Design a protein around this ligand. Structure first.
Ligand SMILES: Nc1ncnc2c1ncn2[C@@H]1O[C@H](COP(=O)(O)OP(=O)(O)NP(=O)(O)O)[C@@H](O)[C@H]1O
Ligand SMILES: Nc1ncnc2c1ncn2[C@@H]1O[C@H](COP(=O)(O)OP(=O)(O)NP(=O)(O)O)[C@@H](O)[C@H]1O
Ligand SMILES: [Mg+2]
Ligand SMILES: [Mg+2]
Ligand SMILES: [Zn+2]
Lengths: 207, 734, 295
C-alpha cells in the first residue's frame, strides 16, 4: 500500500533565530550578519535544509553504532536508501498579520553585540539580524508509507517524534550557543494526504 | 601564389613617399620619392614598378600591370575618390559636433603614455617624423618579400604609422591613418585580384580605369564575419569550490581569444589572404573583406564545417562558430545613407540565422548515439571523455590543458604545434613557449603578445591586455598603507563601453549627411578602440596593485586592491573620455570583498553591479552595492575629488573629532527622514560649541558645508556624501 | 491535448546542468521521470508505461501561469520585414533576448512584431549552504522563487492513472533538492481556453511550434532541421535508481528545445538513455505536443 502522512506543526521561536544567508556587503552602519529572507516578500524564512540537517545531526547523536537515519534522511551510497522517506519544507512565518497586532515595526530585530580582546580589552562590535521572539512558522514533513516499509512505520515514528524533542532541547539555527535558539513545536498533528492510512493511532503518541 | 605577393606589397608600400617627402619637404612627387628610395634596400622590380606607377596620374598609359588594382583599391579604401594639417582625431566626425582635435604623430610602445589628441595641433608637425621615418628605414633595410614576413611588416607600419595622416592636401579625409589606409588598400587589392583572376580577366585598364562605374557598382566583395558562440558560459563556468582561482579564468579567457585569433588566421590561408583583409578581431567576433566568388564561399562553408567538427570533438556544443557573409559593390563610399550598414547587417542576419539552426542530420545523429558507460565526469565542465586525475580531481582533456596553459600564460610567445597542449583547431594545438625554446620546439605559426619590435621569430603580433602586480591573495594584505591604515579588502571591477555596437554601426551618421559613414571610419574606429583596450589599459595599470583578468573588445574585468581599483577606474574613464572627446560612455561596477572569498561568488556580484549601473540611466559606476549608483560625471568630480578631499582635509587637520563622529554622520545620512535634518542641525551645533576656539571656524566651515548638502533637496548631493564617508572610513581603518 | 495542470510551486530548483544554476521551467522529460519514479513507488509502473507508449496521451513542459497560460518565444520569429535608429534597436536586442515567454493574448502580436517588455515573475536567487565541521562544505543552491501568483501547468491527457501520480507529486516534490524543501507544490487541474486547444495539434503539416523538448524519429529528423529554428538543451544527468549502489550517467541526449518553430510536424520518441549494462530502462520522454502559429 502507499500513503503520505504529513506532520503539521506551528513552530515557535522562544528566542530569536539567526539562520544566515549570503554575505553581501558590510556597508558601515548596516547589518553584519543578516538573516535569510524570502526574496519575494522580504520576510524571514527557515529553509528546510536547516531543519533537516539539524534534526539529522541530533538524531545521529542519539543513534550511533546509522541504518535508521539513512532510511529517514537519505544516503548517496547504499542503493536502498536514496531519497529516504522524508521531504521537509521551508517555514513561511504564518503570523505576519498577528505580530504587527502585538505592536512591532519589523519581523526581524537587530541585536548589537561585540567581541572583547583578552589582553588589549578592546571591543569589536556587531549587528546580528535575528528573527523576533514568538514568530510562528509553518511546518510540514511528508513521511511516505511506501509498499516495502510497512512493518517498520511505527519505529520510524518514534524517531521523527524523538527528533522534535531534541530541536526543542537543542537550538535549531546558527550561533545558538549564545541564545538564539529554543524553538518549540506546537499543534504537532499528523494528518494523511494522498493515501489510505489511519492516523488515529499516532496523534495520541504525538500529544 | 607567386605574384599575389608583389601586388600585396605594392599596394602596401605605395604612398610611402608620403613619409619621406612629408618629412624632408622634398619637391618631388610622393609617387616617385619612396619609389626611387625603394631601390636602396632591396632589388625587386615588380613591387617597385607598382610604387612608381600607383597613382596612375603621372603616367596614364605607360605601364598588363598591377597598379590598376592598386589605384582602384586606393580609391575604395579611402572615404572619397582620391596641405599642412596633422592627422585629425577619429571622433571629430563622430556623433554630435565638438572641437576639432588632432594627433601628434608618435610611434607606439608598451611603456609609452598615450597619444591624446588636442585642438592645439592644428599646424603641421614635421620634426616629429625624423624619429618615425628612420625607424622605418632600419628594419626595412634588410627585409624579405614573401609569406615568411608577410605579417611582420604590418606591425612595422602599425607601430609607427598609426598617427600619421594621408594626403593632407584635402578637405575631408584626415583621420584615416596611413597604417590603416595602406592596410585597407592592401586588403581590397587582393580581393580585387581574386575576383579578377577567378573571372578570367587579364587586361585591367578597360575595367578598372575607364570603366570606373562598371566595377564601382559590381557586387564584388564579401564582408564575412564569425561569432564564436558560448564564450561567456565557457569562461564563467568556474564556480564556488574550484581548483583554479583566476588562472583558470585568465588562461581561459585568453585561450578563447587565441582561438578567435586562429580562426581568423587559418581562415585567411585556406583563402589566399593575410592579416590586412581582417577588419577587426575581438571577443569571438571578427569581420573580414573577402572576394565575392564561388571558390571563396565554398571555402568558407567547408572551413566552417571543419572547425565545428573540431568544436564538437572536444567542447560538445558549448562553442559554435557561425560564419556569415554579405556581398557588396563599392558601396561603402559616400543611395548614400541606406547602402553601407544595410550590407554590413547582411552578414549579421546570416549569423543569426546560422546561430539558431546549428547542425544537420548526421552531425546530430552522431551526437545522441548513446553507447557510453560513464561512471565519472570532469567536475569543471561535466564532460565525459578523456578523464585524468590532475591534482586528484577528475578533469578532462581541455581542463588539464588549461592548467598547463595557466603555467605557461606569462610568456610572450605562443606557438601552434600539432600535438602539444590545448587544441585550437583541426590538427592544430597551442603551446606557450619561452623565447630561446623556439629552436627546441617545432611549430608552424608563432604569436608574440604585446610587442612592437619585429623580433627574431618573425611572428604574428597579438595584443592581449594583462597585468599582475602580485598574486591575488596579497591584494587584501597590500590594501593597507605603509602606516597600516586602510581596510583589508580587495575590489573587483567589471567595465563595458555603453552602446558600442550602436556607436559603431550608426556611429558617424549624425555629422554630415551620411557622408562620413564609410568603411574606413569604422576600421579606424575599430583600431582606436582596440588600441585603447589592448594597449593603454596596461599603461593605466602600471603602478597599481591589481590584475587585469581580461581586457579587450570593450570589457575590462580586473581584480586588485581597492584603492588601486577605484583609482584604476577613475583613471581609465578620465583617459577614455579624453580618448573619445566625451563620446562613448563607459559604465563600471566595483565590488568590495573580504580576503579568502571564492572568485565566482566575487565575479558574479561584481557583474550584477555592472548591470545595475547599466540601467541607472546608462553611464554609471556602481560602488560596492546596489544603491551607490552614480553617474561618473556626478561621481569623479563630486564624490571622489570634491567631497572626499574636503572630508579628508577636515579630518586630518584636527584631533578632537574622530571616527565616532563619522559613524554618527553615516547613520544620519543613511536613515534620513525630515526629522534627521533637525537632529543633524542640533548635533553639529552642539559640536560647534564643543570644539576649541583655535579650531572653531574650521569646524564652522565644515558644518555649514555638511548641513548645506544634507538639506539640498536634489538627492544627488546627500547620497554622494555617504559614499564619500564610507571611503574615508575605509581609508583610515586599523 | 486535454486539460492543463496548474501547479503553484513557491519554491523550486530546476537544474541547468549544475547545482549553482536553475531554470524557470522544468523540461517535460523531468516531469515524465517524476511520474515514472512516482509510479515505481506505487507499483503502477507497468500500466503507466503501457499508457505512456500510446498516441493517446501527451506531456508538455512547464510555462509561467499569471492568470492565463503562457507560451514560449517562437524561436526565429519575428522574421524581419524596419531597419532604422541603430541606437535603440541595438539596445533592445539585449532586452528582447531575455523575454522567452509570451501570453496567449498577444502571441500572434509577437509574430507580427511587438516589443513585449518582460514581466517579472520568479526571481532565480542563490544561497550558499554548508555541512558543518567537514572538509569541503560550501555548495551553493540556486533557488527559483516564484512570485506568489505564477504556476507552471504541464498539458496532458486527463487520466486518473496519471491524475493519482500528479496528486502525489503535490507531496513528493518536483525539482532539484526535493528532500530539503524545494519543488513541492499544490496542483489545480483547469480547463483550456478555446484559442489554445484549437491550436494544440500533433499531425498538422503546417508552420508549427514545438511545446516540449522533442527529438524526432530519424525519418522525420532529416527535414526537421531544414526549416527548424531550435536549441539543443543537452538533456544529460545521472540516472536515478534504487538498484546501483553507484552513480552512472545517462546517454547525453540532445533534443530540440521548446519554442522550436517548424514546418511539417514530426513524431517524437521515448529515447532509452540507459547506461551500458544497466538493469532497467531510463526513458527520457521526447514526443511533442505542438502549436499552430499561422493557422
Ligand atoms: N576571451 C574572452 N575573455 C573574456 N571575455 C570575453 C572573451 N571573449 C568575449 N568576451 C566577452 O563576452 C562578450 C560577448 O559575450 P557573448 O554573449 O558570448 O557574445 P557572443 O559571442 O555572441 N556569444 P552569444 O551571446 O551566445 O551569441 C564580449 O563583449 C566580451 O565582453
Ligand atoms: N572595436 C570594435 N569594433 C567593432 N565592434 C566591436 C569592437 N570592440 C568590440 N566590439 C563588439 O561590439 C559589441 C558590443 O557588445 P556589448 O558591449 O555587449 O553591446 P553594447 O553595444 O555595448 N550595448 P551595452 O552592452 O548595453 O553596452 C560586441 O559584440 C563586441 O565584440
Ligand atoms: Mg557594452
Ligand atoms: Mg561589453
Ligand atoms: Zn573540463
Amino acid at each position: 500500500t502507499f500513503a503520505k502522512i504529513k506532520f503539521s506543526a506551528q513552530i515557535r521561536l522562544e528566542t530569536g533565530l539567526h539562520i544566515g544567508g549570503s554575505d553581501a556587503f558590510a556597508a558601515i552602519g548596516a547589518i553584519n550578519s543578516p538573516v535569510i529572507k524570502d526574496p519575494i516578500t522580504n520576510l524571514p524564512i527557515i529553509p528546510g535544509s536547516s531543519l533537516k540537517g539539524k534534526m539529522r545531526t541530533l538524531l545521529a547523536k542519539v543513534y550511533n553504532e546509522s541504518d535508521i537515519l539513512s532510511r529517514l534522511f537519505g544516503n548517496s551510497k547504499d542503493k536502498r536508501f536514496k531519497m529516504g522517506r522524508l521531504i521537509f519544507r521551508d517555514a513561511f512565518l504564518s503570523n505576519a498579520d498577528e505580530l504587527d497586532s502585538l505592536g512591532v515595526r519589523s519581523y526581524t530585530e537587530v541585536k548589537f553585540e561585540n567581541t572583547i580582546d583578552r589582553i588589549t580589552a578592546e571591543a569589536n562590535p556587531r549587528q546580528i539580524e535575528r528573527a523576533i521572539r514568538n514568530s510562528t512558522f509553518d511546518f510540514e514533513l511528508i513521511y511516505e508509507i511506501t509498499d516495502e516499509n510497512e512493518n517498520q512505520v511505527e519505529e520510524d515514528f518514534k524517531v521523527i517524534r524523538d527528533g522534535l524533542k531534541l530541536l526543542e532541547l537543542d537550538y535549531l539555527g546558527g550561533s545558538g550557543s549564545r541564545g538564539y535558539g529554543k524553538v518549540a513545536f506546537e499543534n504537532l498533528k499528523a494528518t494523511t494526504v494522498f493515501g489510505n492510512y489511519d492516523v488515529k493511532t499516532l496523534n495520541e503518541l504525538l500529544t | 601564389k607567386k605574384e599575389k605577393i608583389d601586388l600585396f606589397y605594392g599596394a602596401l608600400l605605395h604612398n610611402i613617399g608620403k613619409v619621406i617627402q612629408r618629412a624632408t619637404g622634398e619637391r618631388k612627387k610622393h609617387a616617385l620619392v619612396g619609389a626611387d628610395w625603394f631601390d636602396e634596400i632591396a632589388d625587386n622590380q615588380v613591387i617597385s614598378d607598382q610604387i612608381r606607377y600607383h597613382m596612375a596620374n603621372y603616367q596614364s598609359d605607360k605601364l598588363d600591370h598591377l597598379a590598376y588594382i592598386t589605384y582602384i583599391a586606393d580609391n575604395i579604401a579611402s572615404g572619397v575618390d582620391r596641405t599642412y594639417t596633422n592627422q585629425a582625431d577619429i571622433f571629430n566626425v563622430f556623433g554630435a559636433q565638438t572641437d576639432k582635435r588632432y594627433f601628434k604623430p608618435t610611434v607606439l610602445n608598451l611603456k609609452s603614455k598615450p597619444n591624446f589628441a588636442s585642438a592645439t595641433y592644428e599646424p603641421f608637425s614635421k620634426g616629429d617624423y625624423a624619429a618615425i621615418a628612420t625607424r622605418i628605414k632600419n628594419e626595412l633595410a634588410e627585409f624579405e618579400f614573401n609569406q615568411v614576413q608577410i605579417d611582420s611588416l604590418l606591425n612595422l607600419f602599425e607601430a609607427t604609422l598609426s598617427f600619421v595622416p594621408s594626403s593632407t592636401n584635402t578637405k575631408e579625409i584626415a583621420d584615416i591613418s596611413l597604417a590603416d589606409h595602406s592596410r585597407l588598400t592592401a586588403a581590397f587589392a587582393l580581393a580585387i585580384y581574386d575576383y579578377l583572376e577567378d573571372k578570367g580577366r587579364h587586361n585591367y585598364k578597360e575595367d578598372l580605369f575607364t570603366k570606373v562605374s562598371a566595377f564601382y557598382e559590381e557586387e564584388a566583395f564579401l564582408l564575412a564575419s564569425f561569432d564564436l558562440s558560448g564564450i561567456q558560459d565557457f569562461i564563467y563556468n568556474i564556480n564556488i569550490a574550484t581548483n583554479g582561482a583566476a588562472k583558470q579564468l585568465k588562461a581561459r579567457s585568453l585561450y578563447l581569444d587565441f582561438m578567435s585569433e586562429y580562426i581568423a588566421d587559418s581562415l585567411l590561408d585556406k583563402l589566399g589572404l593575410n592579416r590586412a583583409n581582417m577588419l577587426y578581431v575581438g571577443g569571438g567576433h571578427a569581420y573580414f573583406v573577402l572576394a565575392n566568388t564561388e571558390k571563396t564561399v565554398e571555402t568558407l562553408v567547408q572551413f566552417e564545417k571543419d572547425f565545428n567538427q573540431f568544436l564538437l570533438a572536444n567542447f560538445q556544443t558549448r562553442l559554435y562558430v557561425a560564419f556569415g557573409w554579405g556581398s557588396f559593390a563599392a558601396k561603402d563610399i559616400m543611395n548614400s545613407p541606406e547602402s553601407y550598414r544595410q550590407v554590413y547587417q547582411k552578414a549579421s542576419r546570416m549569423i543569426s540565422k546560422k546561430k539558431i539552426s546549428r547542425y544537420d542530420y548526421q552531425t546530430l545523429m552522431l551526437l545522441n548515439r548513446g553507447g557510453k558507460s560513464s561512471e565519472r565526469e570532469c567536475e569543471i565542465c561535466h564532460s565525459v571523455e578523456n578523464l585524468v586525475s590532475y591534482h586528484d580531481q577528475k578533469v578532462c582533456d581541455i581542463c588539464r590543458g588549461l592548467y598547463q596553459f595557466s603555467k605557461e600564460i606569462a610568456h610572450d610567445h605562443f606557438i601552434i604545434t600539432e600535438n602539444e597542449g590545448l587544441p585550437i583547431g583541426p590538427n592544430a594545438c597551442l603551446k606557450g613557449v619561452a623565447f630561446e625554446k623556439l629552436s627546441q620546439e617545432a611549430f608552424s605559426r608563432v604569436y608574440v603578445k604585446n610587442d612592437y619590435k619585429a623580433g627574431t621569430v618573425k611572428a604574428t603580433h597579438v595584443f592581449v591586455g594583462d597585468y599582475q602586480c602580485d598574486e591575488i591573495y596579497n591584494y587584501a594584505a597590500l590594501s593597507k598603507n605603509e602606516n597600516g591604515l586602510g581596510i583589508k579588502r580587495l575590489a573587483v571591477v567589471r567595465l563595458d563601453v555603453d552602446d558600442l555596437g550602436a556607436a559603431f554601426m550608426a556611429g558617424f551618421s549624425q555629422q554630415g549627411n551620411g557622408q562620413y559613414s564609410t568603411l574606413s571610419r569604422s576600421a579606424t574606429f575599430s583600431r582606436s578602440m582596440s588600441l585603447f583596450f589592448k594597449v593603454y589599459i596596461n599603461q593605466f595599470a602600471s603602478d597599481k596593485k591589481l590584475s587585469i583578468i581580461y581586457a579587450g573588445g570593450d570589457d575590462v574585468f580586473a581584480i586588485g586592491s581597492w584603492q588601486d581599483i577605484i583609482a584604476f577606474t577613475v583613471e581609465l574613464r578620465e583617459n577614455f573620455i579624453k580618448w573619445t572627446n566625451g563620446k562613448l560612455t563607459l559604465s563600471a561596477g566595483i565590488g568590495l570583498f573580504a580576503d579568502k572569498t571564492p572568485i565566482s561568488l566575487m565575479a558574479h556580484q561584481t557583474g550584477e553591479l555592472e548591470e545595475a549601473a547599466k540601467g541607472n540611466e546608462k553611464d554609471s559606476i556602481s560602488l560596492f552595492s546596489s544603491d551607490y549608483t552614480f553617474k561618473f560625471d556626478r561621481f569623479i568630480t563630486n564624490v571622489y575629488d570634491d567631497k572626499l578631499e574636503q572630508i579628508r582635509y577636515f579630518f586630518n587637520h584636527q584631533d578632537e573629532r574622530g571616527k565616532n563622529f563619522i559613524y554618527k554622520l553615516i547613520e544620519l545620512l543613511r536613515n534620513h527622514d525630515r526629522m534627521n535634518m533637525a537632529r543633524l542641525a542640533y548635533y553639529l551645533t552642539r559640536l560647534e560649541e564643543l570644539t576649541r576656539e583655535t579650531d572653531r571656524d574650521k569646524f564652522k566651515t565644515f558644518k555649514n558645508l555638511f548641513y548645506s548638502w544634507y538639506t539640498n533637496k536634489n538627492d544627488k548631493d546627500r547620497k554622494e556624501a555617504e559614499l564619500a564617508l564610507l571611503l574615508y572610513i575605509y581609508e583610515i581603518r586599523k | 491535448t486535454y486539460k492543463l495542470y496548474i501547479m503553484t510551486f513557491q519554491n523550486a530548483h530546476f537544474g541547468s546542468g549544475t547545482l549553482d544554476s536553475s531554470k524557470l521551467t522544468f523540461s517535460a522529460d523531468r516531469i515524465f521521470s517524476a511520474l515514472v519514479l512516482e509510479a515505481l513507488k506505487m507499483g503502477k509502473l507497468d500500466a503507466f508505461l503501457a499508457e505512456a507508449n500510446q498516441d493517446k496521451f501527451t506531456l508538455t513542459d512547464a510555462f509561467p501561469f499569471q492568470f492565463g497560460p503562457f507560451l514560449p518565444k517562437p524561436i526565429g520569429y519575428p522574421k524581419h520585414d524596419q531597419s532604422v535608429d541603430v541606437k535603440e534597436v541595438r539596445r533592445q536586442a539585449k532586452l528582447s533576448k531575455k523575454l522567452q515567454f509570451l501570453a496567449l493574448e498577444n502571441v500572434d502580436d509577437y509574430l507580427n512584431g511587438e516589443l513585449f517588455e518582460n514581466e517579472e515573475h520568479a526571481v532565480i536567487d542563490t544561497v550558499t549552504k554548508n555541512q558543518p565541521h567537514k572538509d569541503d562544505n560550501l555548495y551553493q543552491v540556486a533557488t527559483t522563487r516564484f512570485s506568489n501568483d505564477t504556476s507552471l501547468y504541464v498539458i496532458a491527457n486527463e487520466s486518473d492513472l496519471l491524475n493519482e501520480l500528479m496528486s502525489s507529486l503535490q507531496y513528493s516534490g518536483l525539482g532539484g533538492k526535493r528532500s530539503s524543501g524545494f519543488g513541492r507544490f499544490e496542483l489545480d487541474i483547469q480547463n483550456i481556453p478555446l484559442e489554445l486547444s484549437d491550436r494544440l495539434t500533433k499531425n498538422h503539416s503546417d508552420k508549427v511550434m514545438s511545446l516540449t523538448t522533442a527529438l524526432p524519429v530519424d525519418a522525420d529528423l532529416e527535414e526537421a532541421m531544414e526549416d527548424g529554428h531550435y536549441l539543443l538543451t543537452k538533456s544529460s544527468g545521472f540516472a536515478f535508481s534504487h538498484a546501483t549502489n553507484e552513480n552512472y550517467r545517462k546517454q547525453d541526449l540532445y533534443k530540440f528545445a521548446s519554442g522550436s518553430t517548424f514546418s511539417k510536424t514530426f513524431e517524437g520518441q521515448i529515447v532509452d538513455v540507459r547506461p551500458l549494462d544497466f538493469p532497467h530502462a531510463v526513458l527520457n520522454y521526447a514526443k511533442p505536443l505542438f502549436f499552430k502559429l499561422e493557422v
